[PDB]
Design a protein around this ligand. Structure first.
Ligand SMILES: Nc1ncnc2c1ncn2[C@@H]1O[C@H](COP(=O)(O)OP(=O)(O)O)[C@@H](O)[C@H]1O
Ligand SMILES: [Mg+2]
Lengths: 157, 873, 42
């Protein structure tokens, strides 16, 4: 939405420039980044927004605009600073309290199948390949995933 | 219309467009004049009431006819706001004309899947819609009963979700008359599950291709259907704990053995016979060395030889491809077609009286040579065995002398038995291939029973199919009407019993129970002195005049002779006893069997590796199926044949109305409205409904389950006169459970949108680090290339590299350093493997002890059952 | 060489135990089918 010129510090400008140049998927260019790739860069650079939020900050664009037109590093930078300042994230106790109700006995573990189902088709729809690749290495023998370890691994990583 | 963007071109075939709804709301109506009136030619007709003179109420039909009726005009129409309704139980007025016309309008708009109460109702399109594309499946992932338009994929998804949540095995039962799409729906469910598994090896491909493999052998053409299912099937899909596909298996039931050698005028034989004769594979026709013309053999050319609706060439191609992908070797495939060619060659046997002495001799031996070579048998030995069976009486092998009739019947019986062993070996092989490792956790079983049939000539193998249809319909009646009307009493819920009048036990007791028709058939089957005519007479002396289901034969309008009329649920059938005794006994030529065990082909040997009347075995298998079903949660998908002439679109009201009456679709919705369809335990409800009103249930205040549920329910804004309370069960009504689920869905949806944002941000971060290290690796590669350019190939570094083998001290030190670090890795691997092995071994000890105790009680209960059956006398 | 022999033997034993526990699953589901059979008998 609104664009603010000065919401930064000079060193993180250099850090963000290094991040963008070393992450720019297109090799033939150096300075421009795909419109659909800008959201991925923002998610990957330490701040995690929602689909609705990233749509709102991006001016509600179209998927064709996402995958066709480009963006510039310092044009997308103020939006990065705005997202970093937003910090619309919960905490450990809130996360485990919300995720606790996904059980029938309160033993501290939840089934992998129900966790996948609620991650995919209960809220913001998640791509399947994502739901398998995020749970790789943390799956247990019988699927009873200890949600506390899961969320602490999520936030730690 | 804003949604359904992922349904693609199938969208108009799932839910009506918004503009159609808007114009439907503008439809003229009265709600005081619009009624339904019974008709003689058709079933029901829309009408407008012109006058109501006391009891008589004159009305004009939609076709302009003026009629009056004795208080039957009270049958009321429905406001135009209810049309093409997905969940048909939501109608304010619900009755026979309402359901009939809702289905009529939907099918006219090419709307086949409907939700009637808790069960799906589907009408055969007879026109392959594009609604089954993989895009539709991708759109149906996770959709609920109301979040999606009615479809078979949504029924499968509901079953999968119930299996995940209730932690219980599920059973999708497909029901309907002959040629009602049951095989189509079964294959579509299998496709849905297989493609969902394929979203995330070749197991899905094998389970998909399993169905055509059995289509070739068991699915033949009959009068009613061109791809009729002769054998009932139950396909079980074992799912892992994670939810990923784990394994699968198939259980198949009795195949129509008389079809192999005998077909009526309008029928064909099993499609494998005619698939080879299409000569799409030249190698098959000449390695079998059979003639291309299908009329040359007398087993497969008695009725019809081909149907325009079926193109056999690509059918054979598909069968070959399915056999290839299933893992079958070339030798097995070639031997199977060899045995099939032997089956059609057996029809060419010619036998004549030797010296008019009532003894059979081979009139022709060339076809006998063909049959002998195909199995690798001995032609002289086979001919001697057929002409002279060497039955052993006492300890003496006395040769029996039989005429041409007995030897030809023996040849037919051998063909039937070997083809049945063929089919069962195929089922075992596919089950072995599909039953891979880790068949753990719960299962979903799709049940496809043989459809009800009424041919012109009814006999045995037409009574077993009708009987199993009766049995499954009675199971549906039990699980809908009786079971819930007793869970009402057991839970202490205020309810009054309702006589739905659908309990099929008198007909089943007339058949299944001892002293019944098939029971006395089994007992008389052991008597060689008895004949069909006496047995039939016995039927008239044991059941006629006592039970209403049994009745004298009809023999209407010069139809083929019928022997007794059985009043099944789907109309009245009329059977013939002639041929039942030998069909039930199924004798076989022991000498020919012994020839089979010493055949060249390992296949023929393993079919006859060893050699229980068929009726008793079928009854036992049927009861086993019902016991499996009673231990699983049923999802009913009832199928309805629109028209008997296989014309797409057209519906005849009497036929569809009659099959909905018989299937009990109408009375299965009264209990879905007048009763309590939904129910859940107090503990689970409180555990997974906390977010709805956490204020009413403080943390650690789980003192009482019932009180907690009561205060959670009252603390919400929902209607409180809808639910009832009972011992560890709350009884909901209508979509109230869906309402609670959707408030939970929206709250947990905000929460999980936050969680998913976090999770996919972390995924983006880890992919960021992956791309960073990939770019750093490429940077290192180009840096080494830059070093190479710096040196290139000046012989000074050549001397350096020649020196390197002379001075390898640091290289050896790094060698031993890597060696000792991998020593540490190997050692820790050793200890972890040993610990895992000892845990596995103690689990083995515990499990084997448990299974030994289970086997002991298995033997004890088998002996107890034997004693109880002995005491039954 | 000795450590490699020990590791190979341990891994082979682990693999045969894995297939053995798969067989234990096979026979345990067979035994639940048998249990269903006795419930059919009654
Ligand atoms: N959804 C459908 N789309 C197209 N054809 C269908 C559909 N359902 C059934 N049919 C047709 O109906 C006929 C009978 O189907 P089938 O599954 O063999 O019935 P049943 O198993 O009851 O004998 C076949 O011609 C089949 O192609
Ligand atoms: Mg069928």
């Amino acid at each position: 939405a609104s664009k603010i010129k000065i919401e930064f510090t000079p060193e993180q400008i250099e850090e963000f420039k290094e991040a963008f140049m070393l992450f720019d998927r297109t090799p033939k260019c150096e300075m421009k980044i795909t419109y659909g790739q800008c959201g991925d860069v923002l998610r990957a650079l330490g701040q995690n927004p929602t689909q609705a939020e990233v749509l709102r900050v991006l001016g509600k664009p179209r998927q064709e605009e996402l995958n066709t037109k480009m963006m510039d590093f310092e044009t997308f930078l103020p939006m990065l600073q705005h997202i970093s300042k937003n910090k619309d994230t919960g905490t450990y106790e809130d996360f485990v309290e919300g995720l606790r109700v996904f059980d029938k006995e309160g033993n501290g573990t939840v089934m992998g199948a129900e966790l996948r189902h609620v991650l995919a088709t209960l809220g913001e729809r998640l791509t399947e390949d994502e739901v398998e690749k995020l749970m790789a290495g943390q799956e247990d023998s019988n699927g009873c995933i200890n949600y506390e370890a899961f969320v602490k691994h999520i936030m730690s990583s | 219309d804003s949604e359904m963007a992922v349904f693609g071109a199938a969208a108009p075939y799932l839910r009506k467009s918004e503009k159609e709804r808007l114009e439907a709301q503008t439809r003229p109506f009265d709600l005081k004049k619009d009624v339904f009136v019974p008709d003689d030619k058709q079933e029901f007709v829309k009408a407008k009431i012109v006058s109501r003179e006391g009891g008589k109420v004159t009305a004009e039909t939609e076709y302009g006819k003026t009629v009056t009726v004795k208080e039957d005009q009270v049958m009321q129409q429905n406001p135009p706001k209810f049309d093409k309704i997905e969940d048909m139980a939501m109608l304010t007025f619900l009755h026979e004309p309402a359901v009939l016309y809702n289905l009529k309008d939907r099918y006219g708009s090419w709307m086949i899947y409907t939700y009637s109460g808790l069960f799906c109702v589907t009408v055969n399109p007879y026109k392959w819609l594009p609604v089954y594309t993989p895009e539709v499946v991708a759109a149906y992932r996770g959709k609920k009963r109301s979040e999606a338009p009615p479809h078979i994929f949504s029924i499968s998804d509901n079953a999968y979700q119930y299996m995940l949540t209730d932690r219980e095995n599920q059973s999708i039962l497909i029901t309907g008359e002959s040629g009602a799409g049951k095989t189509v729906n079964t294959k579509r469910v299998i496709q849905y599950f297989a493609v969902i598994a394929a979203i995330g090896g070749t197991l899905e491909d094998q389970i998909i291709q399993a169905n055509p493999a059995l289509e070739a052998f068991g699915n033949a053409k009959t009068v009613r259907n061109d791809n009729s299912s002769r054998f009932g099937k139950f396909i079980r899909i074992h799912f892992g704990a994670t939810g990923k596909l784990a394994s699968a298996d198939i259980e198949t039931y009795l195949l129509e053995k008389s079809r192999v050698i005998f077909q009526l005028k309008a029928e064909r034989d099993y499609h494998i016979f005619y698939q080879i004769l299409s000569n799409k594979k030249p190698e098959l026709l000449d390695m079998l060395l059979i003639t291309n013309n299908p009329y040359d053999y007398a087993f497969i050319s008695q009725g019809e030889t081909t149907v325009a609706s079926i193109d056999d060439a690509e059918e054979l191609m598909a069968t070959d491809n399915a056999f290839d992908v299933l893992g079958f070797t070339s030798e097995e495939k070639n031997s199977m077609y060899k045995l099939t060619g032997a089956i059609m060659h057996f029809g060419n046997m010619k036998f004549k009286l030797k010296q008019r002495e009532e003894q059979a001799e081979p009139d022709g031996t060339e076809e006998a040579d063909k049959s002998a070579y195909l199995m690798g048998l001995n032609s002289a030995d086979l001919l001697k065995g057929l002409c002279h069976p060497r039955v052993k009486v006492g300890n003496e092998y006395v040769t029996k002398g039989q005429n041409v009739q007995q030897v030809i019947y023996a040849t037919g019986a051998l063909a039937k038995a070997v083809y049945e062993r063929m089919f069962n070996w195929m089922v075992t092989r596919i089950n072995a291939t599909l039953e891979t490792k880790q068949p753990r956790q719960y299962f979903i079983g799709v049940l496809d029973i043989a459809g009800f049939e009424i041919f012109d000539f009814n006999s045995f193998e037409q009574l077993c199919i009708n009987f199993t249809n009766e049995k499954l319909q009675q199971f549906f009646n039990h699980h809908m009407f009786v079971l819930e009307q007793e869970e009402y009493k057991k839970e202490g819920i205020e309810w009054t019993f309702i006589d739905f009048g659908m309990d099929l036990q008198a007909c089943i007791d007339l058949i299944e129970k001892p002293m019944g028709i098939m029971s006395i058939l089994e007992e008389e089957c052991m008597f060689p002195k008895a004949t069909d005519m006496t047995f039939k007479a016995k039927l008239f002396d044991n059941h006629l005049g006592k039970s209403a289901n049994f009745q004298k034969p009809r023999n209407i309008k010069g139809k083929p002779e019928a022997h007794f009329s059985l009043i099944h649920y789907a109309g009245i059938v009329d059977y013939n006893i002639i041929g039942w005794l030998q069909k039930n006994k199924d004798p076989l030529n022991e000498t020919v069997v012994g020839l089979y065990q010493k055949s060249s082909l390992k296949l023929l040997s393993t079919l006859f590796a060893n050699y229980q009347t068929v009726s008793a075995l079928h009854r036992e298998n049927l009861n086993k199926l019902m016991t499996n079903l009673r231990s699983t949660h049923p999802h009913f998908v009832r199928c309805i044949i629109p028209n008997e002439t296989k014309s797409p679109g057209v519906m005849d009201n009497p036929l569809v109305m009659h099959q909905l009456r018989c299937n009990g679709v109408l009375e299965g919705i009264r209990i879905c409205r007048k009763g309590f369809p939904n129910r859940i335990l107090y503990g689970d409800f409180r555990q997974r409904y906390r977010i709805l009103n956490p204020a009413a249930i403080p943390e650690g205040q789980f003192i009482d389950s019932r009180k907690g549920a009561e205060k959670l329910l009252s603390s919400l804004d929902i209607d409180h006169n809808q639910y009832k309370f009972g011992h560890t069960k709350v009884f909901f009504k209508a979509g109230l459970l869906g309402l609670l689920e959707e408030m939970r869905d929206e709250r947990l949806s905000r929460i999980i949108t936050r969680i998913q944002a976090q999770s996919r941000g972390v995924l983006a971060r880890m992919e960021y680090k992956k791309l960073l290290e990939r770019r750093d690796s490429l940077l290192v590669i180009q840096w080494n290339i830059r070093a190479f350019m710096g040196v290139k190939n000046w012989p000074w570094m050549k001397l350096y590299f020649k020196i390197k083998p002379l001075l390898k001290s640091a290289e050896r030190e790094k060698e031993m350093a890597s060696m000792k670090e991998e020593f540490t890795r190997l050692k820790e691997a050793l200890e972890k493997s040993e610990a895992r092995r000892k845990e596995l071994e103690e689990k083995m000890v515990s499990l084997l002890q448990e299974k030994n105790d289970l086997q002991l009680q298995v033997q004890a209960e088998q002996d107890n059952l034997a004693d109880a059956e002995e005491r039954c006398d």
